[PDB]
Motif scaffolding. Sequence first.
Motif, PDB file in Angstrom:
ATOM      1  N   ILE A  74      39.471   2.331  43.212  1.00 50.36           N
ATOM      2  CA  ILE A  74      38.020   2.486  43.440  1.00 50.36           C
ATOM      3  C   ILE A  74      37.163   3.918  42.527  1.00 50.36           C
ATOM      4  O   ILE A  74      36.193   3.532  42.946  1.00 50.36           O
ATOM      5  N   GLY A  75      38.505   4.733  41.968  1.00 47.51           N
ATOM      6  CA  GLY A  75      37.677   5.670  42.182  1.00 47.51           C
ATOM      7  C   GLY A  75      37.486   7.295  42.327  1.00 47.51           C
ATOM      8  O   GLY A  75      36.983   6.748  43.488  1.00 47.51           O
ATOM      9  N   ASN A  76      37.750   8.472  42.542  1.00 51.24           N
ATOM     10  CA  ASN A  76      38.009   9.451  42.759  1.00 51.24           C
ATOM     11  C   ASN A  76      36.659   9.551  43.021  1.00 51.24           C
ATOM     12  O   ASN A  76      35.206   9.349  42.548  1.00 51.24           O
ATOM     13  N   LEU A  77      36.393  10.399  44.242  1.00 49.27           N
ATOM     14  CA  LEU A  77      34.843  11.186  44.599  1.00 49.27           C
ATOM     15  C   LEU A  77      35.061  12.896  44.565  1.00 49.27           C
ATOM     16  O   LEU A  77      36.116  13.875  44.977  1.00 49.27           O
ATOM     17  N   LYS A 127      28.938  13.735  49.788  1.00 51.45           N
ATOM     18  CA  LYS A 127      28.826  12.533  49.324  1.00 51.45           C
ATOM     19  C   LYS A 127      26.777  12.518  50.104  1.00 51.45           C
ATOM     20  O   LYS A 127      26.542  13.371  50.941  1.00 51.45           O
TER      21      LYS A 127
END
Lengths: 173, 173, 167, 173, 226, 225
Positions: free
Chosen positions: D3-6, D10
Amino acid sequence: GNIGNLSAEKQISVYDGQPFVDEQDVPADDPNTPALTIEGPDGYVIAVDAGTPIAPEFRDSNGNKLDPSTRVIVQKCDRQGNPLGDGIVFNDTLGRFDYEQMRTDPDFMRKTAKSLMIDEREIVKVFVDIPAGANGYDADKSRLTLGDDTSDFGKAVEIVDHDELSDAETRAV
Amino acid sequence: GNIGNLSAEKQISVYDGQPFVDEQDVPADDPNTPALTIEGPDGYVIAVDAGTPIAPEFRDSNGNKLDPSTRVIVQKCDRQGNPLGDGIVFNDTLGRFDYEQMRTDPDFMRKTAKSLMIDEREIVKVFVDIPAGANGYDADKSRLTLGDDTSDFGKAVEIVDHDELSDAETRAV
Amino acid sequence: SAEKQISVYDGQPFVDEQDVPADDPNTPALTIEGPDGYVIAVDAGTPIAPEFRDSNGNKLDPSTRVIVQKCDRQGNPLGDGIVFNDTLGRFDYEQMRTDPDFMRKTAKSLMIDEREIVKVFVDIPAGANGYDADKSRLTLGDDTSDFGKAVEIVDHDELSDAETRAV
Amino acid sequence: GNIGNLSAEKQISVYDGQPFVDEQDVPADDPNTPALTIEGPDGYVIAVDAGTPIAPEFRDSNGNKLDPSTRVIVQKCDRQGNPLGDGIVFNDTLGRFDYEQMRTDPDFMRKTAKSLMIDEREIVKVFVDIPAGANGYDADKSRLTLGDDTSDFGKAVEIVDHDELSDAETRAV
Amino acid sequence: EYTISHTGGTLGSSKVTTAANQTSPQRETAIIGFECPRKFAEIEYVGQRDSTRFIPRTTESITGTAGDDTVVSLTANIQPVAGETAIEDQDYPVAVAYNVTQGVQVDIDAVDYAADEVTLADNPADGDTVKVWPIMGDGDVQFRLVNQFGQEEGRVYPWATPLYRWHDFPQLKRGREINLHGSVTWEENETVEVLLDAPQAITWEDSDYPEGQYVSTFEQDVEITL
Amino acid sequence: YTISHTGGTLGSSKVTTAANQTSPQRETAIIGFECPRKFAEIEYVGQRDSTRFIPRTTESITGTAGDDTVVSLTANIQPVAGETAIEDQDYPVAVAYNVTQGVQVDIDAVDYAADEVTLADNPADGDTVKVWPIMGDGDVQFRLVNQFGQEEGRVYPWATPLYRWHDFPQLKRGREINLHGSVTWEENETVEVLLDAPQAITWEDSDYPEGQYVSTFEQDVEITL
């Protein structure tokens, strides 16, 4: 729009319909009448290698086959048509053949013994020896296929025009 | 009385009514049948760079617009006409566009994700994936404008005759 | 060795059949897919036995064209990469898959990975009664003769896999 | 299933449905009413940099827009619910808005004038000053939104969990 | 490797995608599921870079009688499309309607977004039936990952983005088209899903629709590995 | 960079021309294989590339009492691969169709020398029957034609008689025909199958029972891309 230049050695087969060959209906019991008559084509030269097949699909006027004990003969002759005696290629019968397949499978491809070489006027003749009881010869329904020029099997005949020293050494028979 | 020494790289756009493109009406849901068929004009070479827009004015036979859910694909093919699969420049839907102003404002200009190149024989096809109940595709009422040659916005399509070393390079396909 | 010598036919779960109309060549009649874990190899001189017939079990038209052709991983063909383009009229169905003397063979080799696709297209004129593979079928390669040839299958081996990946 | 890091930051907006807020209908001309009470979300922490949009889509009970002369304020309070005077971020009117595009064009989006930082328990309040004539404030047929987090314009709230030294310095209020 | 752009859609590169409806209680459910095929190697969607398009439309029904010019509250907080309320200027119709007994289209004249009401020119007949397909109003959506079991393996940017922005913004314009936040990588057989919570039941494939077979649409510009 | 295709009755393009010869015994153009835009160039290679030719002609008759036999058909019929009886042959020497009933006929027997055949169903008086047998005599070859329509040169200036194509079991490998010569096309160019034969030959009779094409000329070729 290219075609591809060619060697002089045209690889072909020979049959009755060609315009250097003549047929003739025959009676029963002459082994000397020329059924077929080839002649030199007036300028070219023909070479049949030894190891060449035949298909002499010979029949009668009622379409049936001839007597298998018939003997077919093929022979070279002079420019006047007199056979040389020697230079024979063939002496065998029809029963050896099987018209259903005699030009298909090499297991049945009856072939020559010696080579052959035709100048611009030399002649080949084909003769037929039979008893009396047969229904003669009908060339109009019968035919011949000499050699093959289509298959991976068999061999063909080499037609050529005149190349100088080729002809010079070829005429030294 | 001079005109201007021009580069070979002519910057133009494409329209359906040209003698190197053909139209073809379509059934309901036969995607693999081509709407259009662009072929090379037999001697020139074309290049569509990236950033290149489209104005695919597709309508039905009754004048209405098609289903917006319809998928459009443009793709290069081989010289044989078969889709390459790879080499796509576009894949999106009709509903992206506004026929009122799809070619008008850059702000709605949908463009290619790739550059592209075309030889004398190369082919492009424009396939249309449609559901069942659509009213097909009437090219007699519909058309296309690929690229632009007037706007200071967008880009055009380069066309050339054969330049020597560039052509030898272009043949790396 | 891990090389398996087999043949191929329609009823296997990596080859899909499809009924066809009478005047469409672009449709895929038969579609092979890679089996998702093995690799296939065909060599030239490989036979085919496409016993194609109609909805009444009669044979199709001899003038029909058959084509076998490799495609990409998308299902889109390639133009290049054909192995066969000839007619049903050349196949004596009663003895095509029996006599090598009537076995008609391939021209090229071929290699299939886990995703690659092979397809078979058929070009028929208008009048014929189509194609129903419920009665028709195909058979490919011969395991049983010193004559003819078969098809190689393997799992993944490092050197050969990395070499075969260099198409 | 990657899903890919964040980041821990936010980039989002707010509205009434986000359940850390309470609405309250209003009388005619009371400025002191707490129309909207946002409480700290008890486990997350907020960061509203200045330059932050608002769409306070305020309407009457009949669905008509309120008077443009209305003034609107967003203010900080303590954990008990008592304003501070300072910590103001907005003071303007609906005349500087246009409901049909007040979240479309960045030219239209009025924005904050100060920053804001909300702990686990602090409170934001909305204050609404109206003259006599208008028909109060119906939150049922109205709503609010705070933040732009979608287009290639705008600047959203940085919502966060707890980072250690960040909180260590956060509590120097 | 060679990668390109592509458009995941209602039908898309594989006819195994699922479209199904939500439920009436306020529950987040599965609207759409994109199941990846074996044709491809992997798929990527990147928020803030690649775009997404969405037109959701629900269904309602009504019965005719004298005075039935005004179509009643549709139970959805209708919004202007691109800030616009006059139909003919709109990028797409806020709502459409169709008489079933006549089996025909009907146009719309008057509107009210707070009342959620409209008004037509075809006074229907007492004993007649009309269906209406208006856009969807309130609702919050997001994306979900699901592995090859049905087990959830990850959401994207765990914040249910609202719906009515899709209506508010002119989806087609550059710089105003929608980009979400986050990223994602598919695999062979895994599924990605568009999930939503909202009151009203959405629809597709109502055969009585004039402008097409699918009343609503979801599209996503993404990238594909070959 | 090349592969192998075949030219056919239709082949790779719906521009191939099919015309028939004259009754005056003089050679004519049977078929024109015209190269298309799609391709770069075409190659033929005699002695590599096989070829197949099922010719088939037309005759017609009217019925009456005792017509279980059909005449010497002005064609020197030959057995097929030497084989005679129909059901065992590679392909039918001949087929026939009653028009009024509008049906196929099965055949009892053949006599090749008198060139006659014997059926099973005595047709009705006043009825019509068509027959499609093979062709007998005939001399073929290949010709080259530019884009202008001018004859460049014949291939391997030695004709091929027709009946060998019947005499050999064309499908058996090695036995199949391989003519002589080579030839190469260009884009708009054409090559022409020429024939000289006395009887008229056909294609695409609507009333054929087995297929929409009565006669086929298939050929193997090498192709560039």
